[PDB]
C-alpha cells in the first residue's frame, strides 16, 4: 500500500472513541477517516487489509508511519457506524433495506471466509453506512460470541456466523442492545440453556428461522457465510 506523509493530512474534527477517529482530507482532496493508534500490530492490520478487495469491505488509502502517533487512512463512509445509523434513523427504515443491509453485510463476510479470514469482532458497531446506504465491513464482547468462543475460545467463520446472528437483529431492532442489563455470565448461561434473542418486529418469520439457524449451538449446524447469503436472498426474492 500506499505511505501517507502527515503534512498531505488534514485533521478537522474527532468522530469516534476506542485508539480515536478523525474526520480529515488527504491531499486537500479526498475526504477521509484517520484512525490514529502495539504498532507492529496496527501496520500488518492495515497490510492485511490492503490487500482483501470487496465492494463491502472498507478501503485504506494508506499508513502514515513518520510521526507518532501513527495512523491508518480511510475512505471516508459518510453515514459512520452502523449501530449509530440504525439508532439515528429509526422509525425511517423498511423491512427490505434492512434485509438489503444484512445482504451486504453477508457478502462482505463471505469474501473473508473464502479468504480464511476470521473477524472476531462482527457487529453493527464495526459495520460502516456509505453512499446510498451502501454497508461495508470494518477492522477485518460476549453478547457477539458464539457457545464455542466464550466457553472454548473456539474461533471460526462459523462463530463469525453466530456474530452476524446478533448482528441482524441489531439491525432488525433498529440499532438496539443484544442482552440489555444482562451480565457476561447471565449471557453465558441463557444461551447455554437455550434462550435466544426475540424477533424484533420487523423480522419477518422467514427472516428470524435464519437468525436462529446462525444461533445453532454446534457450529457444523450454522451455514456458511457463502451459503446464508443465498437463503438472505431467497427471502428477498420471495416477496
Ligand atoms: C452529524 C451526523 N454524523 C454523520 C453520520 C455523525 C458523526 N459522524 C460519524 O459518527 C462517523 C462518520 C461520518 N464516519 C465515521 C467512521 C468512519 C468512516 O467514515 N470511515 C471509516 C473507516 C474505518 C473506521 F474504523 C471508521 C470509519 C464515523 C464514526
Known sequence: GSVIDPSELTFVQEIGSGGLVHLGYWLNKDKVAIK??????????????????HPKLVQLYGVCLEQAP?????????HGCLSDYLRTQRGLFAAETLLGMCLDVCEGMAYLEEASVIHRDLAARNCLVGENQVIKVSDFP??????????????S????????GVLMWEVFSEGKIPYEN???????????????????????????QI?????????????????????????????
Open 36 to 53: 490514529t493508534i502495539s504498532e507492529e500490530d496496527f501496520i500488518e492490520e492495515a497490510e492485511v487489509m490492503m490487500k482483501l478487495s
Open 70 to 78: 501513527i495512523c491508518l487512512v480511510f475512505e471516508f463512509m459518510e
Open 142 to 155: 460476549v453478547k457477539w460470541a458464539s457457545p464455542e468462543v466464550f466457553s472454548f475460545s473456539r474461533y
Open 157 to 164: 467463520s462459523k462463530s463469525d456466523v453466530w456474530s452476524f
Open 182 to 208: 444482562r451480565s457476561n455470565s447471565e449471557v453465558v448461561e441463557d444461551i447455554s440453556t437455550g434462550f435466544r434473542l426475540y424477533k424484533p418486529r420487523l423480522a419477518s418469520t422467514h427472516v428470524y
Open 211 to 239: 437468525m436462529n439457524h446462525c444461533w445453532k449451538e454446534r457450529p457444523e449446524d450454522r451455514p456458511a457465510f457463502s451459503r446464508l447469503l443465498r437463503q438472505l436472498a431467497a427471502i428477498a426474492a420471495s416477496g
